[PDB]
Amino acid sequence: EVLLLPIDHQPANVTTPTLDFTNELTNWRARVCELMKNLVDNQRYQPGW
Amino acid sequence: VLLQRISPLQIDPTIISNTMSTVTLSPASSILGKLRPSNSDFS
Amino acid sequence: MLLEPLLSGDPRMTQLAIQYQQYNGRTFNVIPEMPGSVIADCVQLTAEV
């Protein structure tokens, strides 16, 4: 009776906050952007700029 | 195509250009040239 | 440009503030207070009537 999904699911309501950090996709986007800020913060790893 | 013709979500790529509002190379314009928001093909 | 730079994101939970950061993590924020409004005051009064 069950259907395997690679994403966690929650009950469907409409007024979720746009900046919800409890779902794994928006949390994933936020952590990738934070790591690229850490990668670009000092100039090393990018000289010649 | 069946998942297209049902879904409430419409994929509308001008949200990226509206958040950028951009215009050597700049990193704000390089991601626009890389993502190509004029392309409407999300198969 | 009457609050056009506020509608590029979520208009529900809006807030206005600013900060800057030195090298050693030291952050200096400025959160200006929201002063009163007369248009919102009269809208709430008309809503009460």
mmCIF file with all atom_site columns, C-alpha atoms in Angstrom:
data_model
loop_
_atom_site.group_PDB
_atom_site.id
_atom_site.type_symbol
_atom_site.label_atom_id
_atom_site.label_alt_id
_atom_site.label_comp_id
_atom_site.label_asym_id
_atom_site.label_entity_id
_atom_site.label_seq_id
_atom_site.pdbx_PDB_ins_code
_atom_site.Cartn_x
_atom_site.Cartn_y
_atom_site.Cartn_z
_atom_site.occupancy
_atom_site.B_iso_or_equiv
_atom_site.pdbx_formal_charge
_atom_site.auth_seq_id
_atom_site.auth_comp_id
_atom_site.auth_asym_id
_atom_site.auth_atom_id
_atom_site.pdbx_PDB_model_num
ATOM 1   C CA . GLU A 1 1  ? 0.000   0.000  0.000   1.00 0.00 ? 1  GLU A CA 1
ATOM 2   C CA . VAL A 1 2  ? 2.964   2.384  0.258   1.00 0.00 ? 2  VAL A CA 1
ATOM 3   C CA . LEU A 1 3  ? 4.850   4.479  -2.290  1.00 0.00 ? 3  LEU A CA 1
ATOM 4   C CA . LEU A 1 4  ? 8.541   5.212  -1.771  1.00 0.00 ? 4  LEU A CA 1
ATOM 5   C CA . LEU A 1 5  ? 9.592   8.846  -2.108  1.00 0.00 ? 5  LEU A CA 1
ATOM 6   C CA . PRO A 1 6  ? 13.077  10.391 -1.847  1.00 0.00 ? 6  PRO A CA 1
ATOM 7   C CA . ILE A 1 7  ? 11.645  13.536 -0.170  1.00 0.00 ? 7  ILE A CA 1
ATOM 8   C CA . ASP A 1 8  ? 9.986   13.886 3.223   1.00 0.00 ? 8  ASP A CA 1
ATOM 9   C CA . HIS A 1 9  ? 6.337   14.906 2.960   1.00 0.00 ? 9  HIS A CA 1
ATOM 10  C CA . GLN A 1 10 ? 4.088   16.911 5.280   1.00 0.00 ? 10 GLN A CA 1
ATOM 11  C CA . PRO A 1 11 ? 0.328   17.612 5.361   1.00 0.00 ? 11 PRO A CA 1
ATOM 12  C CA . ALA A 1 12 ? -0.696  20.024 2.620   1.00 0.00 ? 12 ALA A CA 1
ATOM 13  C CA . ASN A 1 13 ? -1.653  23.490 3.794   1.00 0.00 ? 13 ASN A CA 1
ATOM 14  C CA . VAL A 1 14 ? -1.327  26.655 1.793   1.00 0.00 ? 14 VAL A CA 1
ATOM 15  C CA . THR A 1 15 ? -0.037  29.420 4.088   1.00 0.00 ? 15 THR A CA 1
ATOM 16  C CA . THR A 1 16 ? 3.379   27.969 4.777   1.00 0.00 ? 16 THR A CA 1
ATOM 17  C CA . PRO A 1 17 ? 6.012   30.652 5.357   1.00 0.00 ? 17 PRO A CA 1
ATOM 18  C CA . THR A 1 18 ? 8.085   31.268 2.249   1.00 0.00 ? 18 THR A CA 1
ATOM 19  C CA . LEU A 1 19 ? 11.274  31.292 4.355   1.00 0.00 ? 19 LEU A CA 1
ATOM 20  C CA . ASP A 1 20 ? 10.523  28.031 6.111   1.00 0.00 ? 20 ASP A CA 1
ATOM 21  C CA . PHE A 1 21 ? 13.780  26.343 7.116   1.00 0.00 ? 21 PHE A CA 1
ATOM 22  C CA . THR A 1 22 ? 12.202  23.125 8.385   1.00 0.00 ? 22 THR A CA 1
ATOM 23  C CA . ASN A 1 23 ? 11.831  21.508 4.963   1.00 0.00 ? 23 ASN A CA 1
ATOM 24  C CA . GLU A 1 24 ? 14.860  19.781 3.534   1.00 0.00 ? 24 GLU A CA 1
ATOM 25  C CA . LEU A 1 25 ? 14.868  21.535 0.138   1.00 0.00 ? 25 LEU A CA 1
ATOM 26  C CA . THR A 1 26 ? 14.932  25.127 1.417   1.00 0.00 ? 26 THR A CA 1
ATOM 27  C CA . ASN A 1 27 ? 17.356  24.042 4.133   1.00 0.00 ? 27 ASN A CA 1
ATOM 28  C CA . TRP A 1 28 ? 19.538  22.547 1.387   1.00 0.00 ? 28 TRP A CA 1
ATOM 29  C CA . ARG A 1 29 ? 19.494  25.754 -0.667  1.00 0.00 ? 29 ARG A CA 1
ATOM 30  C CA . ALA A 1 30 ? 20.320  27.832 2.413   1.00 0.00 ? 30 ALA A CA 1
ATOM 31  C CA . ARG A 1 31 ? 23.264  25.633 3.406   1.00 0.00 ? 31 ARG A CA 1
ATOM 32  C CA . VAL A 1 32 ? 24.725  25.568 -0.113  1.00 0.00 ? 32 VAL A CA 1
ATOM 33  C CA . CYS A 1 33 ? 24.531  29.373 -0.264  1.00 0.00 ? 33 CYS A CA 1
ATOM 34  C CA . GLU A 1 34 ? 26.144  29.658 3.190   1.00 0.00 ? 34 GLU A CA 1
ATOM 35  C CA . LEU A 1 35 ? 29.011  27.384 2.162   1.00 0.00 ? 35 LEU A CA 1
ATOM 36  C CA . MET A 1 36 ? 29.618  29.358 -1.008  1.00 0.00 ? 36 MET A CA 1
ATOM 37  C CA . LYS A 1 37 ? 29.731  32.554 1.078   1.00 0.00 ? 37 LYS A CA 1
ATOM 38  C CA . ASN A 1 38 ? 32.353  30.858 3.272   1.00 0.00 ? 38 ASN A CA 1
ATOM 39  C CA . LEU A 1 39 ? 34.242  29.770 0.155   1.00 0.00 ? 39 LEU A CA 1
ATOM 40  C CA . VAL A 1 40 ? 34.247  33.296 -1.299  1.00 0.00 ? 40 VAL A CA 1
ATOM 41  C CA . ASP A 1 41 ? 34.722  35.312 1.929   1.00 0.00 ? 41 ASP A CA 1
ATOM 42  C CA . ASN A 1 42 ? 38.484  35.715 1.933   1.00 0.00 ? 42 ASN A CA 1
ATOM 43  C CA . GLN A 1 43 ? 40.143  36.163 -1.429  1.00 0.00 ? 43 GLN A CA 1
ATOM 44  C CA . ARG A 1 44 ? 42.124  32.903 -1.271  1.00 0.00 ? 44 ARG A CA 1
ATOM 45  C CA . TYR A 1 45 ? 40.826  30.091 -3.493  1.00 0.00 ? 45 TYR A CA 1
ATOM 46  C CA . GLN A 1 46 ? 40.400  32.980 -5.994  1.00 0.00 ? 46 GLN A CA 1
ATOM 47  C CA . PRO A 1 47 ? 43.601  34.874 -6.769  1.00 0.00 ? 47 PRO A CA 1
ATOM 48  C CA . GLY A 1 48 ? 44.097  36.538 -10.096 1.00 0.00 ? 48 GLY A CA 1
ATOM 49  C CA . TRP A 1 49 ? 40.854  38.394 -9.453  1.00 0.00 ? 49 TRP A CA 1
ATOM 50  C CA . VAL B 2 1  ? 2.636   15.900 -19.630 1.00 0.00 ? 1  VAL B CA 1
ATOM 51  C CA . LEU B 2 2  ? -0.116  14.612 -17.315 1.00 0.00 ? 2  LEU B CA 1
ATOM 52  C CA . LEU B 2 3  ? 1.765   16.039 -14.326 1.00 0.00 ? 3  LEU B CA 1
ATOM 53  C CA . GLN B 2 4  ? 2.029   19.333 -16.206 1.00 0.00 ? 4  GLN B CA 1
ATOM 54  C CA . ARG B 2 5  ? -1.674  19.707 -17.062 1.00 0.00 ? 5  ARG B CA 1
ATOM 55  C CA . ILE B 2 6  ? -2.800  19.214 -13.408 1.00 0.00 ? 6  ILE B CA 1
ATOM 56  C CA . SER B 2 7  ? -0.313  21.063 -11.262 1.00 0.00 ? 7  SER B CA 1
ATOM 57  C CA . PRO B 2 8  ? -1.097  24.418 -9.621  1.00 0.00 ? 8  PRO B CA 1
ATOM 58  C CA . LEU B 2 9  ? 2.574   25.334 -9.830  1.00 0.00 ? 9  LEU B CA 1
ATOM 59  C CA . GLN B 2 10 ? 3.503   27.245 -12.958 1.00 0.00 ? 10 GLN B CA 1
ATOM 60  C CA . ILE B 2 11 ? 7.222   27.594 -13.644 1.00 0.00 ? 11 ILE B CA 1
ATOM 61  C CA . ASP B 2 12 ? 7.814   31.291 -14.294 1.00 0.00 ? 12 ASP B CA 1
ATOM 62  C CA . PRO B 2 13 ? 11.502  32.185 -14.619 1.00 0.00 ? 13 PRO B CA 1
ATOM 63  C CA . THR B 2 14 ? 11.179  35.974 -14.598 1.00 0.00 ? 14 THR B CA 1
ATOM 64  C CA . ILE B 2 15 ? 11.200  35.904 -10.774 1.00 0.00 ? 15 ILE B CA 1
ATOM 65  C CA . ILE B 2 16 ? 14.990  35.546 -11.039 1.00 0.00 ? 16 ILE B CA 1
ATOM 66  C CA . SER B 2 17 ? 15.273  38.615 -13.277 1.00 0.00 ? 17 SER B CA 1
ATOM 67  C CA . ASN B 2 18 ? 12.936  40.575 -10.995 1.00 0.00 ? 18 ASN B CA 1
ATOM 68  C CA . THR B 2 19 ? 15.132  39.845 -7.980  1.00 0.00 ? 19 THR B CA 1
ATOM 69  C CA . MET B 2 20 ? 18.318  40.656 -9.900  1.00 0.00 ? 20 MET B CA 1
ATOM 70  C CA . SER B 2 21 ? 17.399  43.811 -11.893 1.00 0.00 ? 21 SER B CA 1
ATOM 71  C CA . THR B 2 22 ? 20.915  44.055 -13.301 1.00 0.00 ? 22 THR B CA 1
ATOM 72  C CA . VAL B 2 23 ? 20.807  45.883 -16.626 1.00 0.00 ? 23 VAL B CA 1
ATOM 73  C CA . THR B 2 24 ? 34.113  43.310 -17.499 1.00 0.00 ? 24 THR B CA 1
ATOM 74  C CA . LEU B 2 25 ? 31.629  40.723 -16.240 1.00 0.00 ? 25 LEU B CA 1
ATOM 75  C CA . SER B 2 26 ? 29.665  40.918 -13.014 1.00 0.00 ? 26 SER B CA 1
ATOM 76  C CA . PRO B 2 27 ? 28.584  37.866 -10.987 1.00 0.00 ? 27 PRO B CA 1
ATOM 77  C CA . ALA B 2 28 ? 24.984  39.085 -11.005 1.00 0.00 ? 28 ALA B CA 1
ATOM 78  C CA . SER B 2 29 ? 24.935  39.028 -14.813 1.00 0.00 ? 29 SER B CA 1
ATOM 79  C CA . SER B 2 30 ? 26.988  35.845 -15.175 1.00 0.00 ? 30 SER B CA 1
ATOM 80  C CA . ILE B 2 31 ? 24.364  33.733 -13.399 1.00 0.00 ? 31 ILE B CA 1
ATOM 81  C CA . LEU B 2 32 ? 21.678  35.256 -15.639 1.00 0.00 ? 32 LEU B CA 1
ATOM 82  C CA . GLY B 2 33 ? 23.682  34.342 -18.725 1.00 0.00 ? 33 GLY B CA 1
ATOM 83  C CA . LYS B 2 34 ? 24.233  30.868 -17.284 1.00 0.00 ? 34 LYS B CA 1
ATOM 84  C CA . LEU B 2 35 ? 20.643  30.151 -16.199 1.00 0.00 ? 35 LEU B CA 1
ATOM 85  C CA . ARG B 2 36 ? 19.118  31.687 -19.382 1.00 0.00 ? 36 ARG B CA 1
ATOM 86  C CA . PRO B 2 37 ? 15.666  32.688 -18.044 1.00 0.00 ? 37 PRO B CA 1
ATOM 87  C CA . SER B 2 38 ? 14.323  33.263 -21.563 1.00 0.00 ? 38 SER B CA 1
ATOM 88  C CA . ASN B 2 39 ? 14.182  29.485 -22.070 1.00 0.00 ? 39 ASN B CA 1
ATOM 89  C CA . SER B 2 40 ? 10.726  28.064 -21.352 1.00 0.00 ? 40 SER B CA 1
ATOM 90  C CA . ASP B 2 41 ? 11.363  24.321 -21.490 1.00 0.00 ? 41 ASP B CA 1
ATOM 91  C CA . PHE B 2 42 ? 11.154  22.488 -18.176 1.00 0.00 ? 42 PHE B CA 1
ATOM 92  C CA . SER B 2 43 ? 10.597  18.923 -19.323 1.00 0.00 ? 43 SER B CA 1
ATOM 93  C CA . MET C 3 1  ? 9.366   53.484 -6.703  1.00 0.00 ? 1  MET C CA 1
ATOM 94  C CA . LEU C 3 2  ? 6.909   53.659 -3.818  1.00 0.00 ? 2  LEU C CA 1
ATOM 95  C CA . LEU C 3 3  ? 8.040   50.536 -1.881  1.00 0.00 ? 3  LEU C CA 1
ATOM 96  C CA . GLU C 3 4  ? 8.925   48.722 -5.082  1.00 0.00 ? 4  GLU C CA 1
ATOM 97  C CA . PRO C 3 5  ? 12.147  47.470 -3.349  1.00 0.00 ? 5  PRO C CA 1
ATOM 98  C CA . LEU C 3 6  ? 9.979   45.735 -0.716  1.00 0.00 ? 6  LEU C CA 1
ATOM 99  C CA . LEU C 3 7  ? 7.866   43.508 -2.962  1.00 0.00 ? 7  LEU C CA 1
ATOM 100 C CA . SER C 3 8  ? 10.682  41.448 -4.478  1.00 0.00 ? 8  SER C CA 1
ATOM 101 C CA . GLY C 3 9  ? 10.254  38.872 -1.697  1.00 0.00 ? 9  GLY C CA 1
ATOM 102 C CA . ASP C 3 10 ? 7.700   37.864 0.917   1.00 0.00 ? 10 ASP C CA 1
ATOM 103 C CA . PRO C 3 11 ? 5.423   40.799 1.861   1.00 0.00 ? 11 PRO C CA 1
ATOM 104 C CA . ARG C 3 12 ? 3.944   39.095 4.935   1.00 0.00 ? 12 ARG C CA 1
ATOM 105 C CA . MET C 3 13 ? 6.752   39.176 7.504   1.00 0.00 ? 13 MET C CA 1
ATOM 106 C CA . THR C 3 14 ? 8.503   42.387 6.521   1.00 0.00 ? 14 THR C CA 1
ATOM 107 C CA . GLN C 3 15 ? 11.090  44.187 8.629   1.00 0.00 ? 15 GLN C CA 1
ATOM 108 C CA . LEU C 3 16 ? 13.636  46.930 8.001   1.00 0.00 ? 16 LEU C CA 1
ATOM 109 C CA . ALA C 3 17 ? 17.119  47.002 9.534   1.00 0.00 ? 17 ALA C CA 1
ATOM 110 C CA . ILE C 3 18 ? 20.790  47.234 8.614   1.00 0.00 ? 18 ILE C CA 1
ATOM 111 C CA . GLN C 3 19 ? 24.145  46.133 9.997   1.00 0.00 ? 19 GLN C CA 1
ATOM 112 C CA . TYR C 3 20 ? 27.824  45.968 9.186   1.00 0.00 ? 20 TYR C CA 1
ATOM 113 C CA . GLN C 3 21 ? 30.546  43.648 10.409  1.00 0.00 ? 21 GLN C CA 1
ATOM 114 C CA . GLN C 3 22 ? 34.246  44.134 11.120  1.00 0.00 ? 22 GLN C CA 1
ATOM 115 C CA . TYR C 3 23 ? 36.825  41.400 10.576  1.00 0.00 ? 23 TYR C CA 1
ATOM 116 C CA . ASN C 3 24 ? 36.576  39.919 14.070  1.00 0.00 ? 24 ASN C CA 1
ATOM 117 C CA . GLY C 3 25 ? 32.862  39.076 13.906  1.00 0.00 ? 25 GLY C CA 1
ATOM 118 C CA . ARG C 3 26 ? 31.828  42.312 15.594  1.00 0.00 ? 26 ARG C CA 1
ATOM 119 C CA . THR C 3 27 ? 28.459  43.367 14.180  1.00 0.00 ? 27 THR C CA 1
ATOM 120 C CA . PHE C 3 28 ? 26.852  46.792 14.614  1.00 0.00 ? 28 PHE C CA 1
ATOM 121 C CA . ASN C 3 29 ? 23.127  46.815 13.883  1.00 0.00 ? 29 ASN C CA 1
ATOM 122 C CA . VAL C 3 30 ? 20.736  49.736 13.489  1.00 0.00 ? 30 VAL C CA 1
ATOM 123 C CA . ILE C 3 31 ? 17.056  48.873 13.826  1.00 0.00 ? 31 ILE C CA 1
ATOM 124 C CA . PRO C 3 32 ? 15.044  52.075 13.346  1.00 0.00 ? 32 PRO C CA 1
ATOM 125 C CA . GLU C 3 33 ? 11.729  52.261 15.115  1.00 0.00 ? 33 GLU C CA 1
ATOM 126 C CA . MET C 3 34 ? 8.503   52.379 13.177  1.00 0.00 ? 34 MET C CA 1
ATOM 127 C CA . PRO C 3 35 ? 6.893   55.773 13.858  1.00 0.00 ? 35 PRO C CA 1
ATOM 128 C CA . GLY C 3 36 ? 3.164   56.308 13.790  1.00 0.00 ? 36 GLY C CA 1
ATOM 129 C CA . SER C 3 37 ? 0.979   56.418 10.721  1.00 0.00 ? 37 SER C CA 1
ATOM 130 C CA . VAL C 3 38 ? -2.168  58.435 10.104  1.00 0.00 ? 38 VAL C CA 1
ATOM 131 C CA . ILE C 3 39 ? -3.319  56.585 6.977   1.00 0.00 ? 39 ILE C CA 1
ATOM 132 C CA . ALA C 3 40 ? -3.229  53.239 8.788   1.00 0.00 ? 40 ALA C CA 1
ATOM 133 C CA . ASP C 3 41 ? -4.864  54.918 11.785  1.00 0.00 ? 41 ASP C CA 1
ATOM 134 C CA . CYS C 3 42 ? -7.757  56.176 9.678   1.00 0.00 ? 42 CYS C CA 1
ATOM 135 C CA . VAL C 3 43 ? -8.072  52.830 7.864   1.00 0.00 ? 43 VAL C CA 1
ATOM 136 C CA . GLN C 3 44 ? -8.370  51.015 11.197  1.00 0.00 ? 44 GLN C CA 1
ATOM 137 C CA . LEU C 3 45 ? -10.866 53.634 12.396  1.00 0.00 ? 45 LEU C CA 1
ATOM 138 C CA . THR C 3 46 ? -12.999 53.188 9.272   1.00 0.00 ? 46 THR C CA 1
ATOM 139 C CA . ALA C 3 47 ? -12.706 49.422 9.730   1.00 0.00 ? 47 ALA C CA 1
ATOM 140 C CA . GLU C 3 48 ? -13.949 49.856 13.293  1.00 0.00 ? 48 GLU C CA 1
ATOM 141 C CA . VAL C 3 49 ? -16.939 51.920 12.128  1.00 0.00 ? 49 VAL C CA 1
#
